[PDB]
Amino acid sequence: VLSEGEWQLVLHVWAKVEADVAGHGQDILIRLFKSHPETLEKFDRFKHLKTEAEMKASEDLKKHGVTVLTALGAILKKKGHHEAELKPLAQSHATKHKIPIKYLEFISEAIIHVLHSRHPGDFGADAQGAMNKALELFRKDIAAKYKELGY
Ligand code: HEM
């Protein structure tokens, strides 16, 4: 459980993300696919983009960066009272996209990496720990929905 103070660190960082949501999202997807190439295979739409240079050039990941980060932002803004926002996403990722929890761990590493890269002097130890606690709660809660569904 996060404190209100930690939630405020999380949401203050999120406002930075929102100043360039497509670029942050593109960067996170590139990191995910470059660091864990098996993840790219889950995306039939994007799996032609096998090099970092192709990924970075693609209008596809800029647009998709908005999709993923807007959804994550909406969940973060619920400060863990996020069951309703989280549920449809868990369902879609278990059944339709078939995404293991390990892959959500991979994208969580990519999020922290990019936040650090893009905000080197304004994403410190406290903000990074708080964001890690928020992402852990997100993953825990998706894992609980996965268990309920039998995925
Ligand atoms: C922060 C974690 C994530 C968030 C917030 C998120 C959110 C979303 C959203 C909002 C959509 C569009 C609606 C839908 O089809 O459900 C989506 C689609 C999808 N997600 Fe995720 N996702 C996350 C992580 C992942 C990961 C780690 C993978 C795979 C390694 C993945 C695979 C997919 C796939 C394959 C689609 C369909 C993409 C398309 O063809 O349009 N997601 N996700």
Side-chain angles (χ1 to χ4, degrees), residues 1-18 73 75-81 115 122-134 137:
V1 194
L2 283 73
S3 77
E4 281 305 301
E6 294 168 326
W7 285 123
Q8 291 315 310
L9 291 166
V10 168
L11 303 182
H12 183 254
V13 165
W14 211 257
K16 304 179 186 278
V17 172
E18 290 179 340
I75 290 160
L76 295 177
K77 292 172 178 177
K78 291 304 184 147
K79 296 185 289 190
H81 311 220
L115 288 173
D122 58 338
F123 181 66
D126 292 344
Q128 179 166 303
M131 184 61 65
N132 269 329
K133 291 180 78 164
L137 179 69

Side-chain angles (χ1 to χ4, degrees), residues 38-52:
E38 67 272 30
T39 60
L40 183 63
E41 295 311 301
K42 291 284 175 187
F43 289 92
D44 294 330
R45 169 189 206 171
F46 303 139
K47 69 181 177 194
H48 60 299
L49 303 166
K50 290 168 101 88
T51 75
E52 177 165 21

Side-chain angles (χ1 to χ4, degrees), residues 96-137:
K96 182 176 286 170
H97 309 312
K98 284 154 202 101
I99 302 309
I101 294 294
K102 184 171 69 169
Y103 289 10
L104 296 173
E105 296 167 354
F106 296 163
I107 206 177
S108 295
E109 190 280 337
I111 291 160
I112 297 297
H113 183 82
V114 170
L115 288 173
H116 177 241
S117 286
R118 278 182 168 255
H119 305 293
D122 58 338
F123 181 66
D126 292 344
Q128 179 166 303
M131 184 61 65
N132 269 329
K133 291 180 78 164
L135 291 177
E136 180 176 58
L137 179 69

Side-chain angles (χ1 to χ4, degrees), residues 41-89:
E41 295 311 301
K42 291 284 175 187
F43 289 92
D44 294 330
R45 169 189 206 171
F46 303 139
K47 69 181 177 194
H48 60 299
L49 303 166
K50 290 168 101 88
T51 75
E52 177 165 21
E54 287 160 2
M55 290 173 202
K56 174 81 181 259
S58 170
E59 179 241 41
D60 285 354
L61 302 180
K62 294 173 193 167
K63 285 185 62 256
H64 192 65
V66 179
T67 296
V68 61
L69 293 192
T70 295
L72 176 60
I75 290 160
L76 295 177
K77 292 172 178 177
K78 291 304 184 147
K79 296 185 289 190
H81 311 220
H82 59 205
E83 190 268 340
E85 337 287 315
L86 190 139
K87 185 198 194 142
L89 183 157

